[PDB]
């Protein structure tokens, strides 16, 4: 890609990554992410638990921002906006505006990006040192827009990139994952893993 920046995960000097709690589905689960494909399956507006793990010392005041992009190369130049019905349905919820489908829980000093010259959409969160018992930064992400939203994604998946850097602007730990909401996380993971397993059969 020459137009938009690269989407390569860092996990370098800090070997920091995003950990999503997974659990085998029996018929219908909440959060189901495929490790092999690094894809996440959730329900519309369902809580998406994300864990920020690191290996080296991260700045006492590191800023970790998460942005949603159009991984769909066929529409990578198609930025996702807020639907007119989604903006008219609700106005205020938890400090997050309808314009942004991404939401953060347990926020302290977060800021929503929206440059008037670039019109970029991304949320930034302040560093919160690990707690005796976790050793990782637990951030809860909520998406108020599923791929089903013909007036939003239009059957186009989106990839979220969580970057952790200093105020000076130095990426220390930044990775990206795929988010798929369709009120069927266990059905998407079981159907994607079960359908992808066979990979064709008849043909002619």
By CB under 5 A, tell whether 18 contacts Zn ion: no
The answer to whether 86 is annotated as binding is yes
The answer to whether 75 is annotated as binding is no
The answer to whether 149 is annotated as binding is yes
Q: Which residues contact 162 (CB under 8 A, 6 or more apart)?
A: 18, 50, 52, 64, 65, 66, 139, 174, 175, 176, 177
Sole binder of Zn ion in the list 69, 96, 149, 181 (CB under 5 A): 149
For residue 128 the two structure tokens come to: 């919160």
By CB under 5 A, tell whether 80 contacts Zn ion: no
By CB under 5 A, tell whether 184 contacts Zn ion: no
Sole binder of Zn ion in the list 65, 86, 156, 187 (CB under 5 A): 86
Distance of closest approach, residue 116 Cβ to Zn ion, in angstroms:
23
The answer to whether 136 is annotated as binding is no
* Closest CA relative to residue 21, chosen from 124, 139, 104: 139
Q: Report in angstroms the alpha-carbon separations of 130 from 14, 30, 54, 58, 139.
A: 15, 25, 10, 11, 11
Where do we find the tokens 């092999």? 36
Smaller CB separation from Zn ion, 67 or 83: 83
By CB under 5 A, tell whether 185 contacts Zn ion: no
Q: Which residues contact 169 (CB under 8 A, 6 or more apart)?
A: none
Residues annotated within a binding site? 83, 86, 145, 149
Binding site per annotation, positions for Zn(2+): 83, 86, 145, 149
Binding footprint of Zn ion on the chain (CB under 5 A): 83, 86, 145, 149, 152
């Amino acid at each position: 890609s020459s137009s938009v920046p690269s989407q390569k995960t860092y996990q370098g000097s800090y070997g920091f990554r995003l950990g999503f709690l997974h659990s085998g589905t029996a018929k219908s689960v909440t959060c189901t992410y495929s490790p092999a494909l690094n894809k996440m399956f959730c329900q519309l507006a369902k809580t998406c638990p994300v864990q920020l793990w690191v290996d080296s010392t991260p700045p006492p005041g590191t800023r970790v921002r998460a942005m949603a992009i159009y991984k769909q190369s066929q529409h990578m130049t198609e930025v996702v906006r807020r639907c007119p019905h989604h903006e008219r349905c609700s106005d205020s919820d938890g400090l997050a505006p309808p314009q942004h489908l991404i939401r953060v829980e347990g926020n302290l000093r977060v800021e929503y990006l929206d440059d008037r010259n670039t019109f970029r959409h991304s949320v930034v969160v302040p560093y919160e040192p690990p707690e005796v018992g976790s050793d990782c930064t637990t951030i809860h992400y909520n998406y108020m827009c599923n791929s089903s939203c013909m007036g939003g994604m239009n059957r186009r998946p989106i990839l979220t990139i969580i970057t952790l850097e200093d105020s000076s602007g130095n990426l220390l730990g930044r990775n990206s994952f795929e988010v798929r909401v369709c009120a069927c996380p266990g059905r998407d993971r079981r159907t994607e893993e079960e359908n992808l397993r066979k990979k064709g059969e008849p043909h002619h």
